[PDB]
Write a protein that binds this ligand. Sequence first.
Ligand code: CBT
Ligand code: CBT
Length: 263
Amino acid sequence: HPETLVKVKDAEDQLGARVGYIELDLNSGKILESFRPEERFPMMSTFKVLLCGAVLSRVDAGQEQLGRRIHYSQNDLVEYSPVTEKHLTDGMTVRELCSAAITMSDNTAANLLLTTIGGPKELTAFLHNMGDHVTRLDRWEPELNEAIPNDERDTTTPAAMATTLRKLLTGELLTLASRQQLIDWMEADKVAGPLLRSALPAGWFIADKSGAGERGSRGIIAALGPDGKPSRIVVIYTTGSQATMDERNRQIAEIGASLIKHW
Ligand SMILES: Clc1ccc(CN(Cc2ccc(Cl)cc2)c2nn[nH]n2)cc1
Ligand SMILES: Clc1ccc(CN(Cc2ccc(Cl)cc2)c2nn[nH]n2)cc1
């Protein structure tokens, strides 16, 4: 609804930053509303859904097993590795790593998983091969969050990410079982999901992944809808803001309020 683009433009004003925004009908893929839909923004931790999709594709192709245990070391650990730092001596299974990456934004977990699939070049190839010719991963954690102005490394657009998410969750790229696992991890997000869930009416379906980088960069991807079933994909990215995290959060909240009001 255009009233929501008013909020998105309010957000650009108050944040002093570029915001990209898109809504996609989940059934058909039609674009319902968009703002800067084909401009690039850093993916940050939102890339971890695409990563675990590529991991699931391997599982489906019998090149990977979710129960396969991955070992690592103190020097593998990068910044913000809340679950992986606890399992130095245990190791973790591929499933546990994807759960840690998506639900908790664990950076080391994402790195370990990036290794299993062939790294950023292979993730990029995976995306290209399912028809996303725009999204690119180039670096590993934590450098991929650098968000240098005008740098295309490690970016998507709201349009490319929205279409990719839809195809991941509803096309035949992944098996039914793999779609359901990937959607389970996203419904279990511990970072943004609890905030979305508390704000929205009871019974609403929410599966999401968010991210934050340097330079006020942040974003989120989401499948949501009333009555326990998603009906729309929403993608929001922003970069360049010097606003406090409070101002940044309040603007996201205003955009989400309008989304629901005009559903
Ligand atoms: Cl309590 C709280 C938790 C997370 C945030 C910020 N978000 C959630 C967020 C980020 C971007 C968008 Cl657009 C929506 C939500 C974030 N995700 N990853 N790191 N931080 C703010 C308050
Ligand atoms: Cl940082 C951040 C995290 C979660 C929210 C969730 N929302 C609503 C919301 C719903 C859908 C989308 Cl796309 C964005 C925000 C909220 N409204 N009031 N307080 N929190 C907002 C900002």
